Amino acid sequence: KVERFEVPRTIIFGPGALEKTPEVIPPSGRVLIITGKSSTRKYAERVAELLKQNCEIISYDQVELEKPGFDLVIGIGGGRPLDMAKVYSYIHKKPFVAIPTSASHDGIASPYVSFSLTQRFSKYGKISSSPVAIIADTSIILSAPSRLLKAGIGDLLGKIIAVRDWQLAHRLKGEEYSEYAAHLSLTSYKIAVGNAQKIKNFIREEDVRVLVKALIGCGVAMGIAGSSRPCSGSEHLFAHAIEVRVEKEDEVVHGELVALGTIIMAYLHGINWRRIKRIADIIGLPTSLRQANIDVDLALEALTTAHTLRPDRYTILGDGLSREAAKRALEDVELI
């Protein structure tokens, strides 16, 4: 039967593209500008001058999601404000404009909210908010720690696993599948390996224009697929199961964990994992648990429980990676 999806209609790319955001706002109604914490306020303020629209700027933690009376919602910052804007957008049925400030994740253009253990927004229904436009100011994005930008490559790497898991789940459990969305996800995976050596450093914006487009493409894949399955499988379960067991997320980064998870899940899938390490090193991502200061026993506890995080999502983890099996995996792949 009939599939339908949305794509960001307008995408502005380049240095000081933040200046151009008025081009993509209709000259109509009031504008909620959701922002991050804490250094994203310059930009969110920066924006508000350029618009003849009256626009209130609430930080994501202070947003009254049910409060109507806004005709458009911008979101600016990282994952948190962007999700929050998506939720606002969905509840009120209003256009959403994404203005990412960092590229470490693939939600940038996904209509879906990030995975949440407590299910922060389950109350609001099946949220689907494909941004009507994306302002990708490469200068803002660029001048960010090289850690968090090289990690965004790491996130791309996991798409080889996520597609496999999703295919498996389709064949074993009948989960809805889209051949195209999977190809689209791998298009973005194939970009990350083909331009691996090329952009590892990030001296120029030309390097992150490739990154961010590739992440944006993953977002649209999820949109076609109907969920994050094309871009997030066992390798992200690994990440999610770690970052739930750290005190502060501050002491660990998603895209590294994803990249580490990818090495592990490649081994479990019985595909070439040696190579994915070879790319990970070349990018400068940690290819060892110790290198990421991840405790051996923390990994084993995550690995052996990750199949329970998302019970309606089947991966190569199947029923449970056993402890003894996870120990050995870490060894053969050399994380430990």
* Half-sphere CA count of 94, side-chain side, radius 13 A: 27
Give the residue, chosen from 66, 250, 312, 319, that forms a contact with its own copies under the rule CB under 8 A: 319
Give the SS3 label for residue 75: strand
133-162 residues in contact with Zn ion (CB under 5 A) are: 155
Closer of 148 and 317 to its own copies (Cβ): 317
Structure tokens at 305: 């429980």
22-51 residues in contact with its own copies (CB under 8 A) are: 23-24
- Work out whether 106 is an interface residue with Zn ion (CB under 5 A): yes
Bridge partners, 136 (sequence order): 13
> Binding site annotation covers 236?
yes
176-235 residues in contact with its own copies (CB under 8 A) are: 178-180, 183-184, 186-188, 190-191, 194-195, 197-198, 205, 210, 213-214, 217, 220, 224
Count residues contacting Zn ion (CB under 5 A)? 3
Q: Compute the distance between CA of residue 336 and CA of residue 333 in angstroms, rounded to an integer.
A: 8
Count residues contacting its own copies (CB under 8 A)? 69
Scanning 49-57, 121-129, 276-284, 322-330 for contacts with its own copies by CB under 8 A, the matching segment is 322-330
Is the peptide bond prior to 232 cis by the omega test (within 30 degrees of 0)? no
Give the SS3 label for residue 33: strand
What is the biggest distance separating any 2 CA atoms in the chain, rounded to whole angstroms?
63
CA dihedral angle for residue 178, residue 276, residue 253, residue 325, rounded to 10 degrees: 90
Q: Compute the distance between CA of residue 119 and CA of residue 137 in angstroms, rounded to an integer.
A: 31
> Binding site annotation covers 178?
no
Q: At closest approach, how far in Å is the CB of 176 from its own copies? A: 10
Q: Which partner from the list its own copies, Zn ion, none does 11 bind, CB cut-off 5 to 8 Å by kind?
A: its own copies
Please name the residues in contact with 96: beta carbons below 8 A apart, sequence gap of 6 or more. Answer: 72, 73, 74, 75, 85, 86, 88, 89, 129, 130, 131, 132
- Work out whether 290 is an interface residue with its own copies (CB under 8 A): no
- Work out whether 125 is an interface residue with its own copies (CB under 8 A): no
First vs last C-alpha separation in the chain: 48
Give the SS3 label for residue 218: helix
Q: At closest approach, how far in Å is the CB of 67 from Zn ion? A: 29
Closer of 80 and 159 to its own copies (Cβ): 159
Q: At closest approach, how far in Å is the CB of 250 from its own copies? A: 31
> Binding site annotation covers 80?
yes
26 to 6, 76, 134: CA distances (angstroms): 18, 18, 14
> Binding site annotation covers 130?
no
Q: Contact positions toward its own copies, by CB under 8 A?
A: 1-17, 19-20, 23-24, 132, 164, 167-168, 170-174, 178-180, 183-184, 186-188, 190-191, 194-195, 197-198, 205, 210, 213-214, 217, 220, 224, 267-268, 270, 274, 314, 316-325, 328-329, 332
